[PDB]
């Protein structure tokens, strides 16, 4: 929890020991908050049983910079590198139905937390 924190935010790895809320703050509606993860994913980070099945949609560094609309924002809160894009799921892949089911579980989960 002490060593996994010293890393700059975007190089942190969320585990059971250092969780998604600890690593990346609360799920939230705010423009700079994250909104992915049910309670199990939040609590387990990359120890989640199905992490590699979510991992496979994460961009490489090259892809992060190659695909995205990249931007800069200078505000009193400081200077920010902005990013947006879109990743096409391969609907010809055998696990396509599962991929959709898994990612639905997590997207905006926090809004139906008890």
């Amino acid at each position: 929890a002490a060593e996994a924190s010293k890393k700059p935010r975007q190089k942190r790895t969320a585990t059971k020991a250092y969780n998604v809320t600890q690593a990346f703050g609360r799920r939230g509606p705010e423009q700079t908050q994250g909104n992915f993860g049910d309670q199990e994913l939040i609590r387990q980070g990359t120890d989640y049983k199905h992490w590699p099945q979510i991992a496979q949609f994460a961009p490489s560094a090259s892809a992060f910079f190659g695909m995205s609309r990249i931007g800069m924002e200078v505000t009193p809160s400081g200077t920010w590198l902005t990013y947006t894009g879109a990743i096409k799921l391969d609907d010809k892949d055998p696990n396509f139905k599962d991929q959709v089911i898994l990612l639905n579980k997590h997207i905006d989960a926090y809004k139906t937390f008890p």
Binding site: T32, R69, G71, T82, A86
Partner: protein, 84 residues
């Protein structure tokens, strides 16, 4: 790439923007000694029908997302397609 025109013409696009209010769709002849024409679609829909046109001449359908101001305003841009 993301815009589709399924014949019977019905335009459809995924929402790639943050906090969309409405869209602005332009259409005219690629090239063409006329200005494009412009109509608006509610934020909630992501399809639109185009009737009129002419066969044999190329068209450019462009989709513009009018959005709340955000960290991503600065970098945003339209989607377009070309068909006949």
């Amino acid at each position: 790439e993301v815009v589709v025109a399924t014949p019977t013409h019905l335009i459809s696009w995924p929402n790639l923007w943050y906090k969309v209010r409405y869209y602005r769709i332009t259409y005219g002849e690629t090239g063409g000694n006329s200005p494009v024409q412009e109509f608006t679609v509610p934020g909630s829909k992501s399809t639109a029908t185009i009737s009129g046109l002419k066969p044999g001449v190329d068209y450019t359908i462009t989709v513009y997302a009018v959005t709340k101001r955000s960290f991503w305003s600065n970098s945003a841009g339209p989607i377009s397609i070309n068909y006949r």
